[PDB]
Amino acid sequence: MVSSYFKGILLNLGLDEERIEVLENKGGIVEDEFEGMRYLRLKDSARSLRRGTVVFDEHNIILGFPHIKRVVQLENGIRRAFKRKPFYVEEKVDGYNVRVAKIGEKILVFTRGGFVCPFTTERIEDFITLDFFKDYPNMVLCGEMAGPESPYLVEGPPYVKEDIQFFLFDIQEKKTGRSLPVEERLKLAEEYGIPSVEVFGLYDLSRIDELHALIDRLTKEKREGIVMKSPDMKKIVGYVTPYANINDIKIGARIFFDLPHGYFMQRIKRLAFYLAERKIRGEEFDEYARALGKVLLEPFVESIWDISSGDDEIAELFTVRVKKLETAHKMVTHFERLRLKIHIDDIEVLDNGYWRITFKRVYPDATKEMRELWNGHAFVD
Amino acid sequence: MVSSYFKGILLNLGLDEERIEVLENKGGIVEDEFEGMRYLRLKDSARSLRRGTVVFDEHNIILGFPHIKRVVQLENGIRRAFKRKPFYVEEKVDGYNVRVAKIGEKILVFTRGGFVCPFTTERIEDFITLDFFKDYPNMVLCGEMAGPESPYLVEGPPYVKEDIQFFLFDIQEKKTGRSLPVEERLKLAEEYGIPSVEVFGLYDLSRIDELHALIDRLTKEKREGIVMKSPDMKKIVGYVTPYANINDIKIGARIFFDLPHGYFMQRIKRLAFYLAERKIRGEEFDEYARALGKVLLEPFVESIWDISSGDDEIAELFTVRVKKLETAHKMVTHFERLRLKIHIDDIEVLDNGYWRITFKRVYPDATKEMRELWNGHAFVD
C-alpha cells in the first residue's frame, strides 16, 4: 500500500510501527505523485501529524492545517476565547486554502487535503514573489485563493472583479507547522510584497459594538466574516456573516444531497444565533426568514425540475485562467484522479494571452438520489 | 442481563444462541416490568423479530411495527408501488401508535418501542369495547392515539376538540404480526364499533388528480396526510401534507438540538418535492418560502432568548385526562424510567370526574448545547 521509504520517515518522526500499519491498511496514509515527485498524504491524523500533512522526504514535511473553531455568539465567544486581552481581527476570505512551499527546486501549492493543485501551482508566481523562498526555504506561505474564476468555488469576495487572487493569512515552519506571531508575519508580507487578508486592526472585548458594526458592513458588502487571532497565534476563532451562511445554503441547495453532514443545519444555527444576539425583530427578522426559505427551496426545486425529465445531471459551471493550455490538460487529469466528474465546456484566448477555460462539474450521486425520489422511490425516515 | 426464561423462548423461536448473547450484551434485548408482569423488549431487530417486539411468554409475543416507507413524489410513488392496481387510501393521523392486546387477564397498551403505557392502558376502555378480546384473544388492535391532550405529542388532528382518541389502522396476529386484509379489518371495526382512521375510499393511479385535491383539503384542514394500502396489506406507503412538514419543523425548532438525525432536512426535502410536483410558483411559492423560514428561525430564536439568562430549561407543557390520580403517579414513574425529565405542573378535577394533569417536559441536553453556544463555546464545523 505505502512504500517503506515513507514508513521509515514516519518511524523517525516517532510514530509506532503498529499505528503506521493500521494507517496503511485503512487508507489513512496514501501515496500520491506530482510531475514525477512521489509523496505521502495523511488522510487521517497521526498523533501530531494533522490530516492534510504531506511528506516528500525527512525535511520536506508540510503540516496540514488545524481545524479552526468558530463561535456563533460573537460577544461571548470573544469573552470566552480572549477575556479582555487584545486580538487581531482579519478578514475571512471565501476561497480555498493553500500552502505554498519550496520542495527541491520546485514551488508547489497544496490544497487542504494535501493534493498538489496543478492550477494554483502554475498561477502562484502571478501573486507571490519567489524571492520569499530564496530567503526562507523552510517556511510555508498559507493563504486563501479567492475570486470569480476559481477551480473549486462558485462564489468569492466582491472586490476581486476577475481571475483569482492570493490572500496570505499565516506563515508556518516546515515539519513543525508552527505559526509566526501576527506582527512578524505582517512584517514579512510587507517586506516581500505578499498580498494579505485585510487586517482590520487590533480589538478587544470592550470594542464589541465596533465589531458588530464591522460585521454589518461586511454583510452588506457580501464578505464572509472575520478571524480573531491572539498576537502569538495560539488562540484563533472565526465568526462569519449572515450573508455567508445564507449564500452558502443557496449554493448548496442546488445539489442538496451528498453534502457534508450538517451542512445546512449548521448554517441555520449560525443564522439563528446572529438574530438572537443582535436582537433582530420585526420586519428585519421577516426579511431574514423569507431569505432563508428562498435559498433552501428555490435552488432545490429548480434542480428537481431540471432532473425530472431524465437526461441532465446537476451541474456547476466555472472558469479559470491559465498561462498554458497544458495546465488545463493537467487539471482534467487531476479532477479525474480526485473522482470528480468535470469536463471542458469552452475555451477562449484572452487579450493578455491567458487561456480562459470553462469547466462543467457534474454531481452524479446527488443527481441519482434526487431522481430516484422524483421517480417515486419509497424510504423510511 | 436477561433471564434464561426469555432466552429459552427466543431459542424456541429459532434464534441462534450466539445472536441472543450478542443482543443481551449489547442491550438489544432488555427486560421490563408492568404491574409486576415481567417481559422482554427488543430494542434491536432480531431476524424476523422487529424492534419494539415484546415477549411475555411462548404465546404472548407482540411483534413490533414495520417501518412504513414514505414517498415524496405522490404520482410516481403510486406508479412505482401500485402500478395501475387499486389501493385503499386512509388518513394518516398525527399521534403516537399503540398496540392493544390481551395478556393473561389484562389488556395492555404498548407504544412503538415496546413499553407498556400506563396512561393509554388506563384509558383504552374509553375507546374500544373489550368484547373484541373476548372473541379474538390472539389478535392485536393497532391504532393511533391522537388529540390535544396527549402524553407524547403537542399537536394533533383538528377534529379532536378535547382529550384524546383512538383510531384503528390495523389488526395483527400475535406472534406472526400478520395483518388482516383491509376489508376484513374494516368489517371487524364495524362489528365491534372500533373507531377507525378515516377511509377515504379505493383509488388508483388514474385518480391522481383527486388525490392531489384530497391532499390540498387535508393541508388546509391541518391534517397529516394519507396512507396507501393494497387490499392484502402487503404494500403500504405514506404521503404527508406540506402542513405536516411545516408544523413538525415549527414544533421541533423550539428544541433544535438532540433531535433524530435528519429531522429538519427530511421535512425540507418533502416540502421541496411537493412544490416541484405541484408546479407551485409565484406568490404561492413565496408564501411557502416565508413559512419555512419562519418555522425554522422564530421558535429557535425564542428559545435562545429563553435560555440566555441562564435559569430556564427548554420545556413543553401538555395535559392529559385520567380516571384515577394513581395513574398520574404511574406516569411520573414511567417517565422517570424512560429517562425523561417531566414533572406535574398543575392538577384539576373536571366536571365529569376525570382528573386533568398538566405535565412539564424539559429538555436538558438540548438546553445545555444551546446555552454553551450562547455562552461562546467554539467548535469546528
Ligand SMILES: [Mg+2]
Ligand atoms: Mg473557507
Ligand SMILES: [Mg+2]
Ligand atoms: Mg461561502
Ligand SMILES: [Mg+2]
Ligand atoms: Mg406519526
Ligand SMILES: [Mg+2]
Ligand atoms: Mg406532525
